[PDB]
């Protein structure tokens, strides 16, 4: 008997279902919002919300298109801010204060994001920041100071692999990863309102990695997350999403760090890219249905579900009042890693909120990065031929 389980009988006797479409697969956070649903579900009567995994976020998006062309959109569904614009374009979203639903408290990191036109259309409910995972073991084996700047991380990743006869920074070939170098080399992604993909920063973040492969101390992952590969070769650092903790957990054999990232200089940690999802409401939802996620969403952003979701996950409290529950603050007592996480958080960028950019991050941008890691293309005409491709679905 699992939450699944639970939930399925849940919403048999329920007269009205709000289905909550998600991206995801499996583990802590997929077992964290299924504790939080049948929470949620106890305290009704003849409501429910039904959680439905769509597989992951590329898929769900895939999938509430097709819902839009069949007219079959659920109530809810997870969103990242450029998806948000998307939907925006057909008139799709709830405004949530429309719902009543009280923002105040909510970290305005997150909810600036979701702000379009001055109104709110998202709740932020599961966002992830980046963080510097590392192996402790490794960097006290060599009396290596976790590093604070990205000078001494590279100067770190080139010690460590000359002693460990490998590359011991490790990364995914993705925009997420490309976003960590970019901004903190002081990138921009829109000038003058013009999406640009290929300017000198994108340049010198994507050499910075190149270099690293063909300088040894850069590990390119390319099947799975990097979290998968632990345990061949030696491993120092990665520069991945919060909600990853429980994932490097479960798979590391050595004893796991979590540290802010490094920056330009130590007066102030690297920028990281916030990442994880939203929470929309579909317009197509009867009234019964969105007062249903208007209690469902003042239940997720209230201090002991944000506590209990983001201790079981990695994801960063979106609320002040999080801060003060004293879940949050006993499992904060224990484990440091988590006001490591709320520090990181404050250090934080976005990508663009464009409608098309699910499709240039992946098919576009994230092309070009491979192209230039994975196939040693020149990265300034990787990122160009990005720009081009880009520019010319602008356009279309
Ligand atoms: N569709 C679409 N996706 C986007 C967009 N912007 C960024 N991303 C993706 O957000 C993922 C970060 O979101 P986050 O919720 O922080 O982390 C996810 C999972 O990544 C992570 N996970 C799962 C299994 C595992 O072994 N390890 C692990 O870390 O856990 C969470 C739940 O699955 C990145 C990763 C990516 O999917 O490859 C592409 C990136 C966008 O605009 N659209
Ligand atoms: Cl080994
Ligand atoms: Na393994």
Redesign the pocket.
Known sequence: MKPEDVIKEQCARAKVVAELWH?????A??AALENLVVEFNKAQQGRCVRPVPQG???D??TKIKAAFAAGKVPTMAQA????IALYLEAKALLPIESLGVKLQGVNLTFLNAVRFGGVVYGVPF????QVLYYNKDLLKKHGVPVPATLEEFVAAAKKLSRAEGGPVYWF?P???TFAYFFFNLGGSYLKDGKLVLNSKEAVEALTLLQNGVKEGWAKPITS?????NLGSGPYAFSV?????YT??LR?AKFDLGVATLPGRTKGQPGYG?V???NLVVFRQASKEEQAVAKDFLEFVLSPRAQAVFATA???VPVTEGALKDPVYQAYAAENPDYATIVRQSRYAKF?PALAE??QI??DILGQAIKEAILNKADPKAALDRAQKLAEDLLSS
């Open positions: 991206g995801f697969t499996g583990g956070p997929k992951g976020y590329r769900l998006s990242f801010e450029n998806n599961n966002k992830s920041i995914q993705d925009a997420s799975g997350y990097i979290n998968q991945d999403t919060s909600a990853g994932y490097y798979a890219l990442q994880g999802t996950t990695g994801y990508e950019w699910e991050r992946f």
